[PDB]
Write a protein that binds this ligand. Sequence first.
Ligand SMILES: CC(=O)N[C@@H]1[C@@H](O)[C@H](O)[C@@H](CO)O[C@H]1O
Length: 398
Amino acid sequence: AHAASYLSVGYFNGGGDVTAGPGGDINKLDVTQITHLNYSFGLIYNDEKQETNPALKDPSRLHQIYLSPKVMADLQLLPVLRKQNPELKVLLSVGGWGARGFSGAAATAESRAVFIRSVQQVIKQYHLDGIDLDWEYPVNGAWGLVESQPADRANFTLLLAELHKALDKGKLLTIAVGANVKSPQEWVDVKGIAPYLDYINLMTYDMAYGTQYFNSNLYDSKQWPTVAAADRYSANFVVDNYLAAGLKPAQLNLGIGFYGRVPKRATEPGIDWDKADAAKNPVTQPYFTARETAVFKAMGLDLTKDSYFKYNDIVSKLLNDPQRRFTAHWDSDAQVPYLTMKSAEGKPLFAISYENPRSVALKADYIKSKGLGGAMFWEYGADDNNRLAHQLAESLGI
Ligand SMILES: CC(=O)N[C@@H]1[C@@H](O)[C@H](O)[C@@H](CO)O[C@H]1O
């Protein structure tokens, strides 16, 4: 008798991000194409000894949220964005890759209460519709990138319960969660936290690591297979792993990457840790030479440091490379595009996978058939004239 109604939740890197670099121009976003904007990022004042941002080390503000000058300035624009789209909801996302402070903020009644008061204060001062927590990651700490402890799982749940209690009726509380199968298994009590959250944003991307070629494939590739089992990921695999853990699909948004990654397999040996003497018997080897790495370096991507390539830069620099060095392809099983570059020997070398309008629309179709609540994407500043967001809006009937 009636139609479904899907979210499209766009993260926007306004303040700067560890992996994605300096913040974008908020004025370039077409906010009519999204249901929700997660302005990223608020950071957390913290006492982690390895924190290298001196502002966050201010002990008088421990456990509070820090908003940089750009963040403050960008948030002053919300009245203009809301006139542009009076349906739009705007949240602040706190955290992000490499962001410290969650483990300590979560750790005691007193720390949780300071954090929650700071969340309430920020919501009221900037008139936000809610808060998104992007803790990467409870328990695991992204393998030591931020502080962590096993009490993180239970503490997160408590933080979220207390936060849900404190938040005005009508305000949104959401989180982003990782792709890794240990996230729902071990790091985050997804069933326990489900009742406190309006929706959950699945980071179904950043898969182009270890022995895997694709960054955000929907299903596994067969033409370009991942070799080590522990690296074998797809957006669908991740979704299924969260579903097995007891979440209802309508509470989930499928995260979509408006970017690509050069897989680490191109430049670093791929280790299968289930093998005998794993570090000396890599199961994949690097297929880029100085010739391929120099091309990326010349484009401002230093592959010894980062593999991140914005969609708009994929378009302008790779697809539209004047020297025609990159050839576009479609992986039929993974349901995403990828590029190859020609080796000196004449062989296609897998350079990068990403998302284009076709693949975004296929992920939308998957959202509709799997019965997910919507899409989320990282991140709006990387779109090309708002085309991928527009696609999503069209495909989801936003
Ligand atoms: C190096 C680091 O701090 N973080 C992780 C890595 O350890 C992880 O195993 C991989 C997923 O396969 O994702 C990176 O973004």
